[PDB]
């Protein structure tokens, strides 16, 4: 395994799902019965959107969006009144990558905060985000389509599933991406839920550098069969994103 220093850390890229990344996501409308109110707050951007946006910032691409996207929220979502349609006019977007900064401490201009919030909202819409206090998506299969069809990434973009490869061939694909300066979108599921994140480096000893999309919390080196950040889990036990794994590779501009 070659040694590759964290590609996103090298560029200062550290996004999250809350403010100021979520300033353009839908505003929660209803209290879910039995829960405390989140009414009037923006929904989380969704880990799938945060992982994808960090990769797009690594490339500063595209300058122009390619195709609009529309979808309808599941009628089972208790945070919104139904029906609820969401639309992102991506075909009209001119993203200014000088204003979509690599990270945000709070002192940035409103223009800079709105620039990253517009990217996060467009990416989230393009992956059919189920918005809420937490926000979920199907992930990889939607990410690969959105990157190519809505954002104009190369036809090299595609989903790979862990179950279709040996461990060696799986890791060799991850390593080839990293050798080409191409951070990898990655997800999995397990006993602390499902999550999406970015693989962006390697230490030569079969651990990979992971950016979890929580602003830096838990980022570090992990084996791909023990993607187990200590920031999750209540009660003291173990858990990680080790099942039903998939990735989106070949992520580079047209």
């Amino acid at each position: 395994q070659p040694v590759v220093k964290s590609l996103l850390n090298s560029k200062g890229i550290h996004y999250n799902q809350g403010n100021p990344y979520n300033l353009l996501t839908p505003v929660i409308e209803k209290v879910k019965p039995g829960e405390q109110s989140f009414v009037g707050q923006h929904a989380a951007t969704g880990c799938v959107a945060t992982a994808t946006a960090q990769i797009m910032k690594y490339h500063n691409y595209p300058n122009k969006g390619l195709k609009d996207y529309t979808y309808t929220l599941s009628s089972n979502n208790p945070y919104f009144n139904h029906p609820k349609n969401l639309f992102a006019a991506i075909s009209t977007r001119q993203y200014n990558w000088n204003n979509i900064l690599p990270t945000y401490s709070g002192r940035e201009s409103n223009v800079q905060k709105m620039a990253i919030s517009e990217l996060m909202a467009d990416v989230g819409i393009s992956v059919d985000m189920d918005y809420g206090p937490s926000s979920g998506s199907a992930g990889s299969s939607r990410v690969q389509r959105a990157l190519k069809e809505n954002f104009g990434y190369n036809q090299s973009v595609h989903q790979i599933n862990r179950s279709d490869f040996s461990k060696q061939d799986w890791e060799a694909q991850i390593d080839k991406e990293l050798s080409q300066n191409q951070p990898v979108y990655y997800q999995g599921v397990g006993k602390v839920g499902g999550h999406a994140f970015v693989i962006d480096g390697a230490d030569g000893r079969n651990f990979y550098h992971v950016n979890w999309g929580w602003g830096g919390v838990s980022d570090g080196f992990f084996r791909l069969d023990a993607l187990n950040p200590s920031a999750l889990g209540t009660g003291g036990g173990a858990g990680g994103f080790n099942g039903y794994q998939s990735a989106v590779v070949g992520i580079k501009p047209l």
């Binding site: 989380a44 969704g46 880990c47 799938v48 599941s74 059919d128 985000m129 189920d130 937490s134 926000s135 979920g136 998506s137 199907a138 992930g139 997800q187 599921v189 839920g193 499902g194 999550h195 999406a196």
Partner: peptide, 4 residues
């Protein structure tokens, strides 16, 4: 839509 369970990847969060």
């Amino acid at each position: 839509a369970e990847i969060x």
